[PDB]
Each structure stands twice: as structure tokens, then as C-alpha cells.
């Protein structure tokens, strides 16, 4: 049908434009603390700490299969990253505050994000 292609279209679009906002909360953790999934090998106790781990590697596979159908289901991850550091690592170390770092400054490209989402539809 030609409305499943309407359907298919705005959805490609969509992930067009949250590859663009994925990049550039990623140009805000330059030391790429979370880029890749921690490492189970290396942290072998985290997942008794974490049940839901989330980086920014996971997060683009899922986006260049097109698994982000909202807005809100992309944010949904990108707070899982942030709230799972600021859980597992203390107050006075480098994970922690490169996460709260990141929280700030990513919610001034999200707050704008929402509203050329809400804008073209
Ligand atoms: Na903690």
C-alpha cells in the first residue's frame, strides 16, 4: 500500500534526524566514556548493580535498523546511560561527573530536538 510507504517514509526520516541529534550528544562525552558497553570481563559484578546497561554504540545499531519509532523511546536510552553512571560510581569520581557533565549539556540539544520533531510532525 502507498500509506505503510507514507508510514515508511517519515519513519526514515526520523531516523535521518536522530542521527544528527545522536552525534552531536555524542560530541559532548570527548573522552567516550560512553561510547562502547561496559565490559563485563573488566566489571564482571555490574549487572547485579544495573539491570538495563546503555551506551552510545547499542543506541546507533538500533537507530541504523530504525528501531526509534518516537522521540521519547530515544531519550528513554540516552537517560539510561546517564542515570546508570550516576548509580554505579560515587559522587567523587570522573564517571559520575562526566555524566552530569553530559546530562546538562545534552538537554539543550534534546529541548530543541522536541520541537523539530513536534514542528515537521
Ligand atoms: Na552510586
Redesign the pocket.
Given at each position: 500500500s502507498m500509506e505503510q510507504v507514507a508510514m515508511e517514509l517519515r519513519l526514515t526520516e526520523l531516523t535521518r534526524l536522530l542521527r544528527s541529534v545522536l552525534d552531536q550528544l555524542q560530541d559532548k562525552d570527548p573522552a567516550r566514556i560512553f561510547a562502547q558497553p561496559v565490559s563485563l570481563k573488566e566489571v564482571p559484578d555490574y549487572l547485579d548493580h544495573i539491570k538495563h546497561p546503555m551506551d552510545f554504540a547499542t543506541m546507533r545499531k538500533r537507530l541504523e535498523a530504525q528501531g526509534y519509532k518516537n522521540l521519547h523511546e530515544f531519550e528513554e536510552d540516552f537517560d539510561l546511560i546517564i542515570d546508570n553512571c550516576?548509580?554505579?560510581?560515587?559522587r567523587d569520581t570522573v564517571f559520575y561527573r562526566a555524566a552530569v557533565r553530559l546530562r546538562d549539556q545534552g538537554g539543550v540539544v534534546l529541548r530543541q530536538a522536541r520541537r523539530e520533531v513536534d514542528s515537521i510532525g
Amino acid at each position: 500500500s502507498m500509506e505503510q510507504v507514507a508510514m515508511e517514509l517519515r519513519l526514515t526520516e526520523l531516523t535521518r534526524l536522530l542521527r544528527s541529534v545522536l552525534d552531536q550528544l555524542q560530541d559532548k562525552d570527548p573522552a567516550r566514556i560512553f561510547a562502547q558497553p561496559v565490559s563485563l570481563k573488566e566489571v564482571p559484578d555490574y549487572l547485579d548493580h544495573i539491570k538495563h546497561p546503555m551506551d552510545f554504540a547499542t543506541m546507533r545499531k538500533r537507530l541504523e535498523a530504525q528501531g526509534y519509532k518516537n522521540l521519547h523511546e530515544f531519550e528513554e536510552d540516552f537517560d539510561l546511560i546517564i542515570d546508570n553512571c550516576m548509580k554505579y560510581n560515587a559522587r567523587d569520581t570522573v564517571f559520575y561527573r562526566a555524566a552530569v557533565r553530559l546530562r546538562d549539556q545534552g538537554g539543550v540539544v534534546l529541548r530543541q530536538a522536541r520541537r523539530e520533531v513536534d514542528s515537521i510532525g
